[PDB]
């Protein structure tokens, strides 16, 4: 979708806030928000592409100024409601309870070794998105291609700044989970993936840096040939 999260090329967002140091987690709630990702992923709330599409649907003013891990909480609730695994009315009641009683205990629960094994296997093994497909790649290194002007309402990786722009294929990486299906609940439907080079003058117009380029990753359906 054409949401405010698609910030590449946006002006006026202000100076970078970069403290001279910072902890990994600023508060206990951030650690919880972070660990909730493997938990909700294992429980089938969402895959990675769907996870991103939840954050893309936030209130844009909230998105621009809220703590990063708050975006994660919003996407958990989004997918909890979408799958019927979270009852909003119960969540609202519990929120008020912990507002009023912040030191009240969490529910009694058993520890589960299988959740630790899940964490260790994901962290050290990874969740590779590379897939084999039957079709060979359409494009190759040095092909001049144009990026789609399509503007899907659903999840995609189509930054407004690259739409309809011409570039050169730099690398074919093989096929990967396709966000335009996976992020909308339509499955992996993997597509060949390319890095494409766009000049700064192509992106930003005749006044752009003549000695800069942007490298952007394009799934096969995003690009069509100008010159082989």
């Amino acid at each position: 979708m054409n949401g405010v999260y698609d910030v590449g090329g946006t002006d006026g967002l202000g100076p970078i806030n970069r403290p001279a140091d910072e902890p990994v987690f600023r508060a206990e709630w951030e650690k919880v928000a972070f660990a909730m990702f493997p938990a909700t992923f294992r429980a089938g709330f969402m895959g990675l592409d769907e996870f991103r599409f939840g954050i893309e649907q936030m209130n844009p003013a909230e998105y621009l100024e809220s703590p990063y891990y708050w975006h994660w909480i919003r996407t958990y609730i989004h997918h909890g409601v979408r799958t019927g695994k979270i009852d909003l009315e119960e969540l609202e009641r519990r929120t008020q309870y912990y507002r009023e009683n912040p030191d009240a205990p969490l529910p009694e629960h058993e520890q589960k070794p299988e959740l630790i094994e899940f964490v260790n296997q994901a962290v050290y093994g990874g969740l590779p998105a590379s897939r084999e497909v039957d079709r060979p790649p359409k494009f190759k290194e040095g092909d001049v291609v144009r990026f789609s002007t399509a503007s899907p309402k659903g999840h995609a990786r189509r930054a407004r700044y690259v739409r309809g722009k011409t570039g050169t294929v730099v690398k074919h990486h093989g096929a990967y989970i396709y966000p335009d299906t996976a992020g909308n609940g339509l499955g992996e439907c993997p597509e060949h993936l390319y890095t494409v080079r766009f000049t700064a003058q192509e992106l930003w117009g005749p006044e752009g840096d003549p000695n800069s380029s942007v490298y952007y990753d394009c799934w096969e359906p995003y690009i069509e040939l100008v010159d082989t």
Binding site: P15, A27, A35, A39, A61, L106, G126, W204, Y215, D217
Partner: protein, 203 residues
Amino acid sequence: TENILRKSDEEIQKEITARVKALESMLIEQGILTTSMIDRMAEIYENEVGPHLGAKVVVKAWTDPEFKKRLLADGTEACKELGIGGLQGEDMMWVENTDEVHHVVVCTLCSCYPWPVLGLPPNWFKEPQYRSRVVREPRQLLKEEFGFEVPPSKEIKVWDASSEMRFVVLPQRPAGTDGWSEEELATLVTRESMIGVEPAKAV
């Protein structure tokens, strides 16, 4: 900075805390989240996985031309030689700074970053200010924000991680380090140097 509509930091933290504790309580009752699972994830990214791992890879490339060739050829396979890889670095592509080219990495659409070599990103990387500006005015951003002057004749290549491909900068080896040990060279390699917003530390 100033938004007249915005609550205090304290009021925002109070509200988020209650909302997260509520959601945590429900996922606990569903049997899908536990206190031990939370602690394990935090410990890994507080103490185990961080930019010291990326620094081992850079210093091996700086001292081993054959490893540097394998690293630039297939970053995932090369890092696995050092037992380095996993979540959010399944597919790594390393890019070599030279006297002719400077590389800088961003994720304009979200916060994608190579966890196995850098750990979790700093907040500035994930925030809209860096993401918006680095694809549009990288030369000015490096100078103004990081005090890093890239002469106009030198190409700047900005890598926008729109896919699961993760881009990592191999910074140039600073002058004055001939015959240094891998341990001594690693003191010059920073998270910033592997993002491309700073060179490796001068001696």
